[PDB]
Amino acid sequence: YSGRDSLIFLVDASKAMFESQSEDELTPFDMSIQCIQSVYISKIISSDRDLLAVVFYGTEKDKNSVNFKNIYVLQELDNPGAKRILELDQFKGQQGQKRFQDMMGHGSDYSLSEVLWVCANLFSDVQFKMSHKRIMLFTNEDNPHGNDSAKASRARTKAGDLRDTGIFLDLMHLKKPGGFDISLFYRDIISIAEDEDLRVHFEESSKLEDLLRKVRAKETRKRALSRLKLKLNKDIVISVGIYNLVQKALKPPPIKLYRETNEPVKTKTRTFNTSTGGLLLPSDTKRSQIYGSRQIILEKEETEELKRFDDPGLMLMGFKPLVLLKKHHYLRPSLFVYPEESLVIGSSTLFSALLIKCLEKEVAALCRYTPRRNIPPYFVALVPQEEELDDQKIQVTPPGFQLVFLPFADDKRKMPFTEKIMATPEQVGKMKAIVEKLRFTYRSDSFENPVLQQHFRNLEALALDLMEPEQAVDLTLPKVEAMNKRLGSLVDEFKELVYPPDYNPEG
C-alpha cells in the first residue's frame, strides 16, 4: 500500500434534491454538503497529503477540460484546506441553496457517461502516485435514465470501463419520497452489490453516519523504524524489522510567522567570538568538563567516539525463563520485531521456528540492542507474540517478537524504609465489596487525549472562523456522582472501620 487516496464527491443537482419531506428535516443537498465538509475536516486532521475533489452534475453551467454540458467541476483534485471548506460553507443553509442556484443552476438534463468521463479525466490529471481511486455518488433518483435506454447502456459501459481502470464506485443514496431501490439501474454501476443491499430503502444510507463521524486522530501508514541484523553467532545472521506499535502523539510543531504580512520566517543560529566578533566554525571549538577542580578538554570527534561500543543490530545472548521478567521493571515503550526477507533469504523460517519453540518452552530471547551508530548498547528481551484474532477474524495481535528494554543498576532507585501494617479480614472484605461495585471493562482505545482534542478543536475553529470552539468532553474525569450512587453506604462503613472518629484526612 503505497501512494495517495484520491476522492471525488459527485453531488446531484436535480430538483428532487432540493425538496424536504418534512418541515423539520435536512434537504438532500444540505446533508451531502455536511458530509463533504465533515470528510474534509477529517482528512485535514488525519491525512493532509491526500487528494479530494468536488463536482456537480445536473447544473446549468459547465466548467471542465472537455467542455461537456451541465457538469460543473467546483474543485479539482488537490490537497484539502480551510479555503475549500469555507467555499463549500456558502451552500449550507437555504440562503446557501439560493446562492448555489444563482451561481450554477439546477433542474437540467444530464448523462451519467459524461460525468464518469469527467471524473476519469480528473483522475488522469493527477501526477502523483495514487494508491486508491474512489468516487461517491450522492443522489436520490434511482432511475436517472428511464426514458432513454441508450443512455443507460452508455452509463453501464462507462462504469465497466472505470472498474477495469481500477476506480471504485460508491452509492450514498439519500431519502426519497417513494423510496430508493438499487435494483432498477445501480446494480451494474455500483462496484460491489452486497446481498443485503437489494431491498428498498426508505431512509438515507447508513454510510452517511460513518462519514459524519469526525475522526480527529492522525493516521500513520506502516513504516519500519529500522532494519537490523539478528546475529545468533558470528556466522548465522538474519534480517529483522523493528516497528513501534505504540507511539506518543505530539502536537504539530509551531511555526514562526511575520506579524505584518503573515508569511513564514526562517531562523538561523550562528556562534561568534566576543573580541573579534567574526563567525566561529565548529572546527575551532572544543568541549570541557570540570572534575576534581581541573579542566578536561576533549575534541568533538572524541566525544562522539566515546559512545562507540559495537555495530548496530541485535546480538543474541541466550534464553531466559519468562518468570524472571518483572512487570514493574518497565523502562521504555516496547517495540515489535518481524522477519524481513528482502535483505536475507531464509530468515523467515528460522524466525518462525524460534517463535514456535519459544512459545512452547515459555522462554524469552535475551539480546544486546544497538539501534544506530555511536549509541551505547542496551539489554533487551524478545518475548514471543502469537497471532490472536477476534470474532470477525480481524487480526488484533500480530505474530512476532516483543522487544522490551531491561534496566541497568543505575536505572533503579532506593525507596525510604517504611514499616508494614496489615489490615484485618473485615477491612479487606469491605474494600473487596467496594472494588467489585466499581468493576468495568477496560480496553486500549477507551480514552482520548483531552489536550490534543482541544488543540484540534481550537485550530479548526480559528481556521474556519466558528463562533465558539467545540468543547470536547473529557472521558478521563472520574464520574463522581455515579460512583457515589453505586457505592451507597459502603464508603461510610469502610471509613468507620478504618479511620478513627477524629482523623480529618483532608487536613
Binding site: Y1, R213, V215, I394, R439, F440, D445
Partner: peptide
Amino acid sequence: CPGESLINPGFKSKKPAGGVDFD
C-alpha cells in the same frame, strides 16, 4: 475488508471512545 474506514482506506474504522461503563 469488513468494517473498513470510509475516510482512510487501509485502516479499520476506529470505534468511538466510550470511557468507563460500569456493569
